[PDB]
Specification:
This is part of a larger assembly, with one copy of chain A, one copy of chain B, two copies of chain C, one copy of chain D, one copy of chain E and one copy of chain F. Chain A is mainly alpha-helical. Chain A is built from 18 helices and three strands. Chain A has a domain of about 100 residues: Orthogonal Bundle (Cyclin A, domain 1), CATH 1.10.472. In chain A, helix 4 crosses helix 6 and helix 10 packs across helix 11. In chain D, about 25% of the residues lie in helices and about 35% in strands. Chain D contains four helices and ten strands, in the order E-H-E-E-E-E-H-E-H-E-E-E-E-H. In chain D, strand 9 and strand 10 form a beta hairpin. The two termini of chain D are about 15 Å apart. Chain D has two domains: about 90 residues, 2-Layer Sandwich (TATA-Binding Protein), CATH 3.30.310.10; about 90 residues, TATA-Binding Protein, CATH 3.30.310.10. Chain F is about 55% helix and about 0% strand. Chain F contains five helices and no strands. Classes of the chains: A mainly alpha, B mainly alpha, C mainly beta, D alpha+beta, E mainly beta, F mainly alpha. At the A-D interface, helix 8, helix 17 and helix 18 of A face helix 2 and helix 3 of D. The complex binds zinc ion (2 copies). Chain E: It is found in: Nucleus; Nucleus, Nucleolus. Chain E: GO terms for molecular function: DNA binding; DNA-directed RNA polymerase activity; zinc ion binding. Chain E: One of its GO terms (cellular component) is RNA polymerase III complex.
């Protein structure tokens, strides 16, 4: 309030390089002048971080320090920004706060480093495959997933879902069919932008047709990019196989990639049957690759009609007549027991006892 | 691409064939202008491909 | 120009092919990045040349 | 407006104390269906003619009976075990019996978008298809952990009474339907 | 409120909301300029 | 020094790698006569897997446990009949039957 | 970036936030005077509800300047870089 009139219309108005909080009613100067520093003075104040001035970095064990250094090393290897590094170290400290993870196994804390890196990578919508994480973390997928579930159930942090398009782009950037290298001839080299767009359309079709739900996404991504690479030039690539493409691209062939490809080709055949000219052509899983492109031009109505005429595993679409058969309720409890004949037939006879003793002698 | 100020200066440097004896000086202020002491010239050019 | 606009560095990824022994089994790598060298403009590898 | 579907309990787990020390060596030696290996595990595995049942008996008298389908069936199996232990030559008793956990299964008969479900109930759900195809939901009102599959099957666990599983399923049905 | 921008190479009017990855369709250029205002501005020929 | 003892491997693409989650188990299926003699061994011993694994040298105890669980989950009447019937433990004739099973699997491999 | 703080008395932005657009960023084509904000930036003070404090980029200048272009880029750190080109 103003000391003269008591008004609360105090505005900070700088008058010719003079900061001044003055009232807007009577112009009474409430406060004036501000102490800043000067450049040489700024130069001579040295930068000291809270990690040292607050007092932390001293009540830390060598194990926690090794974990932090491993987090930073993996971050720098993956070439993630310093913001990602900071988020990773922060989440690692937050997880270490707990005692169950504090007094854990060496593999446990290694998987903790890995899962903290994974959570930091997910929080920024960045794609990073848990397979490569485990490969660079010196761990196995089983224990990795076990400890991941344990730590997420113990913490309760937000776990954004892995976007499909980002992973698609990340995996398409891996293939070397963009620049003509000595090994790969020019015929296999294809355009990057068009092939990436085709793979994105194919993986969106797969996500909308219930193909990626419940299954690994990377096999579907591989099948989609393979179908795109074959459709961009069906002539020279009609004989190329999935294993041949993987060998040429220097990529580890996923196992279910073949099944995903076979299912996606079946979906494409259904779209062809929906279309007019293709259903008259009577194409197949080998000749629909040249028209895959046309199938994606108006795939909306095609998928709509396909669903009009749900994608489930093959083991469930085998005419499930008796779904979850009702078992006969048997609550017969008698009075309290049945008899002692069953007790006697359960008890081991002396002959069998002696035989087991002779065998395990 | 030409700057607004440079365009305004070039337009001001353009002479007008209007007879000045039939007009008068604008008073202090009065940016709206009056029919006696103001002339309006519109310029609207939209370039497009042939 | 895009680098100047975005306030980033105009560098190229430095890659190398190496060979090491993990468990006495020689394993080789044909392409591994190790750093980034700022590329001079109008150089041999620059996009302007 | 009920859901019209009733889950089916496939496992009933209950701990019960006998109140006396036991000699696992003799228990396993004087029985035919006895499975015990002290270097591997310190519990004797008893199996009976109840429809499905496995008892993990220990030396301190604590035994966990699992695999039953109802609370009454689990109690009958536990009493059967206790009688077998008594006939083996030990003063076993049936004290401190209480249902610890019950696993049930159900089906909704229509697909479920796991991504949409997790986007709608993230704070109560978790979806990691790269690890387990099933989405893991953790509800409190039901007091239950649920594994939901794309095919429409839901496995519920973490309850104490059949009514808890029933009301949890009744509450989760409209969320999955919507 | 539809906020419009222009791409650095495509020069197409793109509409994006707040907190979105700065990108432009049918390309991958990450330079987005703001269109000129529609308000009336007065200039002096001096 | 390694005098050309090993060969270089062109694996581990620096780009990325995926997971497997399945490494070692890779069990081997049973047969009709093998299931019959397995039910016989069940009727003869019980549920103790240690003795079953000791008497079965060529099949693993974990595989035996998996088979027993599968039978308990699918065919309950067969397990009930097995526990109903009983046979005294035979050692010499059991080793003879083991040799017979070895000969049978050898003939199978020949086929 | 907060929107222009409209004055409830006149239903128009205040003299300081007059040059700001609907997104709080000054639009090209207008003139900027002394002690005027170009980006109505607000940053959190925590690093339970976040508490944002305003730190606008005021224009220190004796003479007026005209905004020619306003470039907005996004870095790999999800950081938005805004560059306004003032001309005199
Ligand atoms: Zn005052
Ligand atoms: Zn563009």
């Amino acid at each position: 309030r103003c000391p003269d009139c008591g008004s609360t219309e105090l505005v900070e108005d700088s008058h010719y390089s003079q900061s001044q909080l003055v009232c807007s009613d009577c112009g009474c100067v409430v406060t004036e002048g501000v102490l800043t520093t000067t450049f040489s003075d700024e130069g001579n104040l040295r930068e000291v971080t809270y990690s040292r001035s607050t007092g932390e970095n001293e009540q830390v064990s060598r194990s926690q320090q090794r974990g932090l250094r491993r987090v930073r090393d993996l971050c720098r290897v993956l070439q993630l920004p310093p913001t990602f590094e900071d988020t990773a170290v922060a989440y690692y400290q937050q997880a270490y706060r707990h005692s169950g993870i504090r007094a854990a196994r060496l593999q446990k804390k290694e998987v903790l480093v890995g899962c903290c890196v994974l959570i930091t990578c997910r929080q920024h919508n960045w794609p990073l495959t848990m397979g490569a994480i485990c490969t660079l973390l010196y761990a196995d997928l089983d224990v990795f997933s076990s400890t991941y579930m344990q730590i997420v159930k113990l913490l309760g942090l937000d776990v954004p879902s892995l976007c499909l398009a980002e992973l698609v782009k990340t995996y398409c950037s891996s293939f070397k069919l963009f620049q003509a290298s000595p090994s790969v001839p020019a015929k296999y080299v294809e355009d990057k932008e068009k092939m990436l767009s085709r793979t994105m359309q194919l993986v969106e079709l797969a996500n909308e047709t219930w193909l990626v739900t419940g299954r690994h996404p990377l096999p579907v991504i591989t099948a989609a990019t393979f179908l795109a690479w074959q459709s961009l030039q069906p002539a020279d690539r009609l004989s190329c196989s999935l294993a041949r493409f993987c060998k040429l691209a220097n990529v580890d062939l996923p196992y279910p990639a073949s099944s995903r490809l076979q299912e996606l080709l079946a979906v494409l055949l259904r779209m062809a049957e929906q279309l007019a000219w293709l259903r008259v052509l009577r194409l197949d899983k080998r000749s629909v690759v040249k028209h895959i492109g046309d199938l994606l031009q108006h795939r909306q109505s095609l998928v709509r009609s396909a669903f009009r005429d749900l994608l489930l595993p093959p083991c469930m679409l085998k005419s499930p007549k008796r779904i979850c058969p009702v078992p006969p309720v048997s609550t017969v409890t008698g009075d309290e027991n049945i008899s002692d004949s069953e007790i006697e037939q359960y008890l081991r006879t002396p002959q069998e006892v002696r035989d087991f003793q002779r065998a395990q002698a | 691409i030409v700057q607004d100020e440079i365009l305004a200066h070039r337009l001001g440097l353009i002479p007008i064939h209007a007879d000045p004896r039939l007009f008068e000086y604008r008073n202090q202020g009065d940016e709206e202008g009056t029919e006696i002491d103001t002339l309006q010239f519109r310029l609207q050019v939209r370039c497009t491909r042939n | 120009h895009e680098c100047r606009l975005r306030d980033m560095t105009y560098s190229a990824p430095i890659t190398v092919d190496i060979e090491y022994t993990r468990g006495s089994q020689r394993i080789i790598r044909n392409a591994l990045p190790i750093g980034r060298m700022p590329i001079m403009l109008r150089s041999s590898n620059c996009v302007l040349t | 407006e009920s859901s019209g579907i009733v889950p089916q309990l496939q496992n009933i787990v209950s701990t019960v104390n006998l109140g006396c020390k036991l000699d696992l060596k003799t228990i396993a030696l004087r029985a035919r269906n006895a499975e015990y290996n002290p270097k591997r595990f310190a519990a004797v595995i008893m199996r009976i003619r109840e429809p499905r049942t496995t008892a993990l008996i220990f030396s301190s008298g604590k035994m966990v009976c699992t695999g039953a389908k109802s609370e009454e069936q689990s109690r009958l199996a536990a009493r059967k075990y206790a009688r077998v232990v008594q006939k083996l030559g030990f003063p076993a008793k049936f004290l401190d019996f209480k249902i610890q956990n019950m696993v049930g299964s159900c089906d909704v008969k229509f697909p479920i978008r796991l991504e949409g479900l997790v986007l709608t109930h993230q704070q109560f759900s978790s979806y990691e298809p790269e690890l387990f195809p099933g989405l893991i939901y953790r509800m409190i009102k039901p007091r239950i952990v649920l594994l939901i599959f794309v095919s429409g099957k839901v496995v519920l666990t973490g309850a104490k009474v059949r009514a808890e599983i029933y009301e949890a399923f009744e509450n989760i049905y409209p969320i999955l339907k919507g | 409120q539809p906020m419009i921008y222009i791409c650095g190479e495509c020069h197409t009017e793109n509409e994006i909301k707040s907190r979105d990855p700065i990108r432009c369709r049918e390309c991958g250029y990450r330079i987005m300029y703001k269109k000129r205002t529609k308000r009336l501005v007065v200039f002096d020929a001096r | 020094c390694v005098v050309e003892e090993n060969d270089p491997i062109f694996e581990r693409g620096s780009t990325t790698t995926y997971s497997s989650f399945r490494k070692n188990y890779y069990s081997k299926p049973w047969s009709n006569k093998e299931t019959d003699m397995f039910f016989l061994a069940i009727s003869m011993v019980g549920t103790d897997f240690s003795m079953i694994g000791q008497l079965f040298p060529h099949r693993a105890r974990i595989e035996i446990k998996n088979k027993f669980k599968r039978e308990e989950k699918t065919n309950g009447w067969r397990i009930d009949k097995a526990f109903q019937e009983k046979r005294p433990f035979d050692f010499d004739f059991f080793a003879h039957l083991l040799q017979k099973v070895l000969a049978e699997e050898e003939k199978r491999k020949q086929k | 970036v907060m929107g222009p703080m409209l004055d409830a008395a006149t239903r128009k932005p205040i003299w300081r936030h007059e040059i700001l657009d609907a997104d709080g960023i000054c639009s090209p084509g207008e003139k900027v005077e002394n002690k005027q904000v170009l980006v109505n930036k607000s940053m959190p003070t925590v690093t339970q509800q976040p508490q944002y404090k305003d730190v606008p980029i005021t224009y220190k200048g004796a003479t007026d300047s005209y905004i020619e272009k306003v470039m907005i880029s996004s870095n790999a750190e999800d950081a938005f870089l805004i560059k306004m080109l003032l001309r005199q």
